[PDB]
Structures are given as structure tokens and as C-alpha cells.
Design a protein around this nucleic acid. Structure first.
Lengths: 546, 251, 85
DNA sequence: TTTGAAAAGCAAGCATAAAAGATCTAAACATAAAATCTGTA
DNA sequence: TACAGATTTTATGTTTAGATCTTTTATGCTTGCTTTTCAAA
């Protein structure tokens, strides 16, 4: 059986886009096709820019590392906030050989393995450029005799906050012995993810005094100075400029989620931007009108949906206070620029170039421009006081702009990318009628699913539960006569009828249904058995809403 | 419980009170009825195949209308992680075999092969899983320089696969259906590192399921970035007949 | 109260490491040097719990007790009165 | 405003779970000389 | 047939992942005793 194997491969027998028909299934398939094609143009125009930005990130990181690296002690570099995913390349300079030795905490169980791996890497690189050796530090001693060149080792310690600091301290003290060989120079790179002070107290004071003789700090987080996330957000602004607009709720959600992630919030930002674009091009039937070629394909369904617009609602209510024409109005009034993105780019390049204000985030600037508080964002620097009237902007609440918007009100972004996983499990357990429809019809209405009843009795019990008392409490809610009527409603199965004929049938059925749910609860992680060979009491591990 | 709160940290602190020794009951299973294995199995399958089968079938017909959205999420590089109350075994097989592999195979013109891991099995082993992955995908063998010094050959091979498949066209070649990504042998760190690094590759589709309430504790920022999950609650109150036989039930 | 510079806790760490290196304190229940190379190799592939906690919580034991300290510290020393309890 | 009394907290004792690690083995990873296969000349 | 070269067999060394068992220390239940705030007079 395939259900009992560890793994198996299936080559299933077979006998064109994932977009479905909107407009209650009265949309045409050609509009589905151009929805797909418009989504792909927007996605490609975003991700080409994102790829260029990422390549620029690694390029300037390599340049800054090499500048700090080449311009009787170690040359120590602390890369603060580093995920250790940077490819360090050394120069090719004659009469000296430069080796990069990368060491991970998995590759560092003790000092002996650290030295053996480093010396194998040293000998492998030096043999690969231009007789066996012992993989210890004497190869560093005899390097000029065996290869005719001076030696520059750069040690890149990947993920320093995971390494054993006693082993690392002993390895650095061991590497100190190479200082007397006159042809060797050693650089150390520590990829720190917490703080320098944490790795200060985990090392010996003499090791700190050794490292202090020549050291530099280089801070490269994912949003060091916000400069790289601003580029990604601006490329997303340019790919939807004049085409889609951002609500303040969506930008607020973006800022809230980037505040909750430290090292990898650039990819998280790209992830929610692409998921919002996916949700729009999967949801909105009006996205074909993103392209101004498709405006002649209007229908009565389109005009019926677009009439329920609150901005158009207020516009026609103001008109009455003060179809063909509606069609011409809808054609004419979607042309304009919506200049919030151009003004945001102008304010960004004015603050970055002229005033030399560089520690700003474009996302909160765009949020304040969306809510009309750009002065209330700008007055935190006390340098653009003379230009507050210069950079003043107020948004124009254009009509049917919510038919082309990226907005977070349904919680689809919350449910898909950052769900309340444990709370959703507990809510589905406690309130199962929001899961199972309300359509053996007598039993399905009078008795709950066993997992939900077990969770209802679980929630209102103590920290320690006696499972016999728990099983009696579960048994008192079940109906006896309806269960016995349901178990006898299968006349083909005679063992069921024979067990239903016994006077202790309901206790056995209740115990079977109780034990299946108890093992389900144990597998899910809700309950914990106390002892291995007692199995008489349980502890609750899980409380709802915490 | 003789308590004032049930939910939140208030309920956590209020329900963990020091119960006295005299208040504790002494009831055991000795006053419980004795059942055999066969009547347990008989009542089990009868209740699984007749209690609320019609609402479960209606709800399963409701969740099948989300299959094009799942396919659309898989074409953009997201990995599907399905969670909920009840078994998701039949759902994952039916979506990944009856729907996803023929749609992907027709969309890029045999069907796409589907490798199914059973993480509810304690004997699910990452080396044999990578052996079948190597058999299906035929990657280039590591050179002597790439083997490092007693390095893990599986992880180094997958890193070679990652910087090989970055240049290939974005065509899905393998579907990886992981049942119970939180099961006893798959939840270990080496297996999770292996599967997140396989989730990096655009040309592999990842469909996974979890059962534990604490399953997002398995993934840090590196693993959540590499996995790139879209989460979907598909709670159905399915009985989990297949996964229950890998534990000793009657004890 | 009856003037010595009171050294801060960040400076006493160097003194503490010097005292550990000079075999005045030993880590609690530490085996030390193994009898043979096989046990030493087995110990070199295991990470001890003392080396993964911060240094200010590591448990130590004395190689010289307070009574010995009272025996060999001179009477003219101004910390002599605290070797008594 | 009191009452008092049942819940909460303290503490000695003791069985028991569990942390730490000593000792060891399987398995992945790695090398190598002699024998044996293998495709040609 | 002979033979150079490639692969297999036999044989051993290196390193990591994990199991088992012991010893010492945390911890959870028992039981008796003291303090304390909360639902009625």
C-alpha cells in the first residue's frame, strides 16, 4: 500500500490558465486571457527592476568589503546584521596568494577540525592555481618554500552567533601563532547577527585585546538606512503609476509587517506586493481596463458593478443636490495621471540630493502623502522648514479609483501570508459550525463532531484532567437513543447489530469515539500524557487566544 | 473548571491553580469498559463513513473551487502549506494528482511526476527521498572541489542544483507533495533544511501539510524565506484513518 | 566605611579569567585531562554545557579553601580579616 | 463596617523525572594495493 | 593470446549522528500549618 510507505513516486495518467471567469461567469474568455497577459507584463516589469536592485546590493556590498579589507596583528572586520550569504572575492595581485577560507558552525565542532578544514582549503587553492602535506599550521610556516609566494588568508566565519565561542576563541589564539612567519597576513571576517556586545562577553579579554589592535565595523542589514527598500518600493510605484493606486491601509500593513522582520524584510516586502498584485488580477474584472485598448468591451454587468462606487455615489448625490453618457463618462474619467507617485519621487529626490536627508523611508513618506500629512512627516528633521510650502501636496479623491486599487480590508493578506495559525485552529475546534455546513440527518444536527465536543469540554476543564472523568463528561452530552438508532441503520453489517444488541453498547461507542479524539488531540499537540506507563491523567498544553 | 477566565493569558493563569490532594479524583481506566481491537476498528470505520459524511462532502466540494487559485500561487513560486483540523491526505492527493499535474502538463505545451512523502511515517528518511529526487531530476554530480571536507553531500548537491536551475527556464518539472511536514522524522532540522533548499528551486512545486499547533516554530527567517509559504486553512474534520495506524491506539 | 578603588564588573572579568587560568578555580564537575586518547577524542566531539552559557553563570569550585587562605596570607595584609567567617 | 472562613501560600519530606555526560557504535565519507575484468593489437 | 587500462575486491582510516546507561540534581505530589482578601451579616 502507498499509504504505509515512507515515500513513493506517482506518474499519473493524463487524458489552460489558472484564471477563472469573473462577472458571475458571464465574463468572456478573451478578457480572462488579457487579464493574464496584463498581470504578466506588470509582474515582469516589477521583477526585472527587483533583480537589478538585488544585483546592485551584492555589488556594493562586495565593493565596501574589499575597500575595508585592502585599505603583526589580524585585520578584523565585523559585518553587523549579516546573513552570511555574501560571496567575497579577493583580488588577483602578483607575488602573493590570497585565499578565502569559509567556516560554518557545522564545520566547526572543535579547533582540530577547524584547522584541518582551513589547511585543506589552503592547500587545495594553492595547488589549483599553479607531494602530500600535513594539514596543520606548519604548511603556513612552509608556504613560501612550497609555493614561492607570500600568503594572505581571509577567514570568513559564517553565522558567528551560532558557533561555540570557546572553540572560536581557541582557534583565534591558535591563528595568532602565524604572526611570526614574516610572509603571512591574516584577515578575519565575523558575520554578526545580534550585537557586538554579545560576542564581546562570550570571548576572553585577552582575545578582545588582540582583536582591538586593528578592527573595523561594517553595518549591512537588509534596510541599513532604508536605501535598498526604497528602491524596491519606488520600482513598484513606477510599475503601477497611472494604472493602480495604493490605499493607506495597504501601506500601513506593509510598514507593520516590515517592522516585524529584521533580516529578510526586503523579500517579505516583495512577497506582499506580488501577492496583492496577484489578488487584484485574480479578483477584479476591471483589470482589463488597465489597458486603454480594451475600453470598448463594456457590458451591462460592468456598468452595474461600477455604479456601486462610493466616490461616484457622492458625485451623483452632489449632482442631484446641485447609460451612453455614463459610458462616455467612464471612458473619459480614467485617463488622468494621479500624480501622487510623481510627487513622491520628486520629494524623495529633493530630500536625498539637496538637503542630504538620507535616513528616510519612502514607504512612510508615501503613507503620509496618502493621508495628507507630508508636513507632519517632514517637520521631524528641522531642515526643510523653508520648503514646507514648496513640497505641499494634497491628494485628489478621484471617482471609481477603488476599482483600480490595492487595499487591505478583507484580511486576505493577513490570512494568506501571516495567519493567526494557532488561533484559527482553536477557533475551528471551538466553533465548528463555521467550518461544517448546516444541511443520518437526525444525528448530524443533534450531536457535534467529536473533536469539537472534545475541545469544548477541554477548554472548560483544569490544567490537569482525569480522563475517566473527562470521558464521563463527554458521555453525558451524547444522545443515547439517537446513537443506538444510527448504529442499527446499516443492516448489511451484522457485527454492528450484534454489538448494538449488547446492553453496554453506548459506553463502548463513547469510549471508542473518545479514544480516537484523545489521540487526535495528542497528535495535534493539545494534550500531554504525564507518565509513560500510567496514561491516566493529561495536561492541557494549549489555551485559546494566547 | 472552577475558574473565572477561559481564554487568553488570564485563562492560562486562572486555570493553573494548585488543586489540593483531597480534591483529586482517583478514577482510572479500571472502571472503564474494555473494548477489543476489532470492535474499535468496526465502530471507527462506521462512524468515519457515516457520521456527517454529507456536510463533509459538501464542504470538500466547496474547497475544490480554490484549485485554480492554488495553481496560480504555485506558478508564481509560492509553496502551498495547508493546515487545519482533520486529515488533509485525500485533499492533497486529489489536488496534486487529479488537478495539478495534468493542468501543469497541458499548460507548458506524460504528466508531471508527483513525489509523495509521508511524514506521518517515522521511517521517512531524507537520504532516500533525495535518492528518488536525484533519480527523477538527474542533477550533475559534485566534483572533488565541491565535496569540501566531510561535508554533507545532499546539501552541497542541492546548492549545486540551486545555482544550476537559476538559469533554466521556469518550467515545473517535479511536484513534491509532503504529507505532515511536522511529523516525527521530517520535523528534524536536517530534513527541514533539505526541503527549504528544495523549495528555493522555482522548477519544483511544493505542496505541504502540517498538523501540530506549534508548527511555525520549525521555521526561522532563513527557512521561512526559502520556503516562501502561502498558508491555507482547509479544516474539514476528516477522521485521519491512515495516520492513526502509525501510533499504538488501544493503549 | 572604616580608600580602595572599587573596580567595575566589566573589569573584574579579566581578573576572573586570570584566576581561572592560574588553576585557582575549576569548572564544576569537570573531568579535566582524560586518561587516554580515545576518551579525549570522545570528549572533543561533545559540546559541554559550561561553554554555551554566559560566563557569569558558570559554576566553579575552589582549588584552595578559605582556611588555607587564612593560613598563608600574612597578618599585615589588609584583606586578612575576611579569611575568617 | 465586621466576620470568618475558604482559598492561597510555606515548608519539610520523599519519590521520581530529567540534565549532563561518559562510553560507545553505526553510517557517511575517504583512501588504496592486489586481483580481476575489458576492449583492443 | 598478450596486454595496457579501467573497475572490483578487500581492507582500513576519518568524521559525524545518534543510542544507551549512569549519576546527580530539579521537581511535583503529600500533608500539615499560617496568612489573607471576598461574599454574606
Amino acid at each position: 500500500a502507498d499509504a504505509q510507505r515512507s515515500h513513493y513516486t506517482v506518474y499519473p495518467s493524463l487524458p489552460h490558465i489558472p484564471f477563472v471567469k469573473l462577472l458571475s461567469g458571464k465574463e468572456s474568455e478573451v478578457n480572462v486571457e488579457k487579464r493574464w497577459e496584463l498581470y504578466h507584463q506588470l509582474h515582469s516589469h516589477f521583477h526585472d527592476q527587483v533583480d537589478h536592485i538585488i544585483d546592485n546590493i551584492e555589488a556594493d556590498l562586495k565593493a565596501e568589503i574589499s575597500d575595508l579589507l585592502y585599505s603583526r596583528c589580524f585585520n578584523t572586520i565585523f559585518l553587523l546584521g549579516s546573513d552570511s550569504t555574501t560571496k567575497i572575492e579577493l583580488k588577483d595581485e602578483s607575488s602573493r596568494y590570497n585565499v578565502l577560507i569559509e567556516l560554518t558552525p557545522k564545520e566547526s565542532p572543535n579547533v582540530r577540525m577547524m584547522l584541518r578544514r582551513s589547511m585543506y582549503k589552503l592547500y587545495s587553492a594553492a595547488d589549483a592555481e599553479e607531494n602530500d602535506v600535513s594539514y596543520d599550521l606548519s604548511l603556513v610556516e612552509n608556504f613560501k618554500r612550497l609555493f614561492g609566494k607570500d600568503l594572505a588568508m581571509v577567514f570568513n566565519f559564517k553565522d558567528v552567533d551560532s558557533i561555540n565561542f570557546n572553540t572560536l576563541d581557541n582557534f583565534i589564539i591558535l591563528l595568532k601563532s602565524a604572526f611570526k612567519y614574516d610572509h603571512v597576513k591574516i584577515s578575519l571576517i565575523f558575520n554578526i547577527n545580534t550585537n557586538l556586545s554579545n560576542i564581546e562577553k562570550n570571548l576572553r579579554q585577552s582575545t578582545i585585546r588582540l582583536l582591538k589592535r586593528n578592527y573595523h565595523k561594517l553595518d549591512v542589514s537588509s534596510n541599513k538606512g532604508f536605501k535598498y527598500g526604497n528602491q524596491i518600493f519606488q520600482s513598484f510605484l513606477d510599475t503601477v503609476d497611472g494604472k493602480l493606486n495604493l490605499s493607506d491601509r495597504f501601506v500601513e500593513f506593509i510598514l507593520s509587517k516590515m517592522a516585524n522582520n529584521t533580516n529578510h524584510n526586503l523579500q517579505l516586502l516583495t512577497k506582499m506586493l506580488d501577492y496583492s498584485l496577484m489578488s487584484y488580477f485574480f479578483q477584479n474584472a476591471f483589470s482589463v481596463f488597465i489597458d486603454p485598448v480594451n475600453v470598448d468591451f463594456l457590458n451591462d454587468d460592468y456598468l452595474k458593478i461600477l455604479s456601486r462606487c462610493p466616490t461616484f455615489m457622492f458625485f451623483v448625490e452632489g449632482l442631484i443636490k446641485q447609460n451612453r453618457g455614463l459610458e462616455e463618462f467612464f471612458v473619459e474619467f480614467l485617463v488622468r495621471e494621479n500624480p501622487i507617485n510623481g510627487h513622491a519621487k520628486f520629494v524623495a529626490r529633493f530630500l536625498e540630493e539637496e538637503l542630504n536627508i538620507t535616513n528616510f523611508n519612502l514607504i512612510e513618506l508615501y503613507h503620509n502623502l496618502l493621508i495628507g500629512k507630508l508636513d507632519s512627516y517632514l517637520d521631524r528633521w528641522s531642515a526643510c522648514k523653508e520648503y514646507k510650502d514648496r513640497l505641499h501636496f494634497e491628494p485628489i479623491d478621484t471617482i471609481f479609483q477603488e476599482l483600480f486599487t490595492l487595499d487591505n480590508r478583507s484580511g486576505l493578506l493577513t490570512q494568506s501570508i501571516f495567519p493567526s495559525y494557532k488561533s484559527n485552529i482553536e477557533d475551528n475546534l471551538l466553533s465548528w459550525e463555521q467550518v461544517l455546513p448546516s444541511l443520518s440527518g437526525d444525528l448530524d444536527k443533534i450531536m457535534a463532531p467529536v473533536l469539537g465536543q472534545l475541545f469544548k469540554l477541554y477548554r472548560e476543564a483544569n490544567m490537569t484532567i482525569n480522563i475517566y472523568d473527562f470521558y464521563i463528561a463527554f458521555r453525558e452530552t451524547l444522545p443515547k437513543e439517537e446513537i443506538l438508532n444510527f448504529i442499527r441503520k446499516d443492516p448489511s453489517n451484522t457485527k454492528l447489530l450484534e454489538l448494538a444488541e449488547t446492553p453496554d453498547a453506548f459506553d463502548k461507542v463513547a469510549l471508542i469515539l473518545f479514544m480516537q479524539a484523545i489521540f487526535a488531540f495528542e497528535n495535534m499537540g493539545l494534550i500531554k500524557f504525564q507518565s509513560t506507563k500510567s496514561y491516566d491523567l493529561v495536561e492541557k498544553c494549549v489555551w485559546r487566544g494566547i | 473548571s472552577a475558574s473565572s477566565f477561559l481564554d487568553t493569558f488570564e485563562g492560562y493563569f486562572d486555570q493553573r491553580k494548585i488543586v489540593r490532594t483531597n480534591a483529586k479524583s482517583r478514577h482510572t481506566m479500571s472502571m472503564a469498559p474494555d473494548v477489543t481491537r476489532e470492535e474499535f476498528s468496526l465502530v471507527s470505520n462506521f462512524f468515519n463513513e457515516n457520521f456527517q459524511k454529507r456536510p463533509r462532502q459538501k464542504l470538500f466540494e466547496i474547497q475544490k473551487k480554490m484549485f485554480p487559485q492554488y495553481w496560480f500561487e504555485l506558478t508564481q513560486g509560492f509553496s502551498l502549506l495547508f493546515y487545519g483540523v482533520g486529515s488533509k491526505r485525500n485533499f492533497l492527493e486529489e489536488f496534486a494528482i487529479d488537478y495539478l499535474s495534468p493542468k501543469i502538463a497541458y499548460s507548458q505545451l506524460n504528466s508531471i511526476p508527483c513525489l509523495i512523502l509521508n511524514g506521518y511515517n517515522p521511517s521517512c528518511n531524507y537520504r532516500d527521498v533525495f535518492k528518488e529526487i536525484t533519480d527523477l531530476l538527474v542533477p550533475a554530480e559534485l566534483t572533488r572541489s565541491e565535496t569540501k571536507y566531510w561535508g554533507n553531500h545532499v546539501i552541497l548537491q542541492i546548492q549545486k542544483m540551486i545555482d544550476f536551475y537559476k538559469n533554466q527556464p521556469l518550467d515545473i518539472k517535479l511536484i513534491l507533495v509532503v504529507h505532515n511536514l511536522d511529523g516525527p522524522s521530517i520535523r528534524k532540522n536536517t530534513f527541514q533544511t533539505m526541503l527549504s533548499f528544495l523549495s528555493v528551486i522555482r522548477q519544483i512545486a511544493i505542496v505541504a501539510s502540517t498538523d501540530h499547533i506549534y508548527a511555525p516554530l520549525l521555521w526561522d527567517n532563513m527557512k521561512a524565506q526559502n520556503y516562501n509559504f502561502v498558508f491555507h486553512d482547509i479544516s474539514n474534520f476528516e477522521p485521519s484513518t491512515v495516520e492513526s495506524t502509525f501510533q499504538d491506539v488501544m493503549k | 566605611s572604616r580608600t580602595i578603588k572599587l573596580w567595575l564588573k566589566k573589569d573584574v572579568k579579566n581578573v576572573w579569567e586570570n584566576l581561572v587560568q592560574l588553576d585557582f578555580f575549576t569548572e564544576k564537575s569537570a573531568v579535566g585531562l582524560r586518561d587516554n586518547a580515545t576518551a579525549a577524542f570522545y570528549a572533543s566531539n561533545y559540546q559541554f554545557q559550561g561553554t554555551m552559557i554566559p560566563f557569569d553563570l558558570r559554576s566553579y569550585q575552589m582549588q584552595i579553601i578559605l582556611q588555607e587562605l587564612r593560613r598563608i596570607i600574612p597578618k599585615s595584609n589588609m584583606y586578612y580579616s575576611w579569611t575568617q567567617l
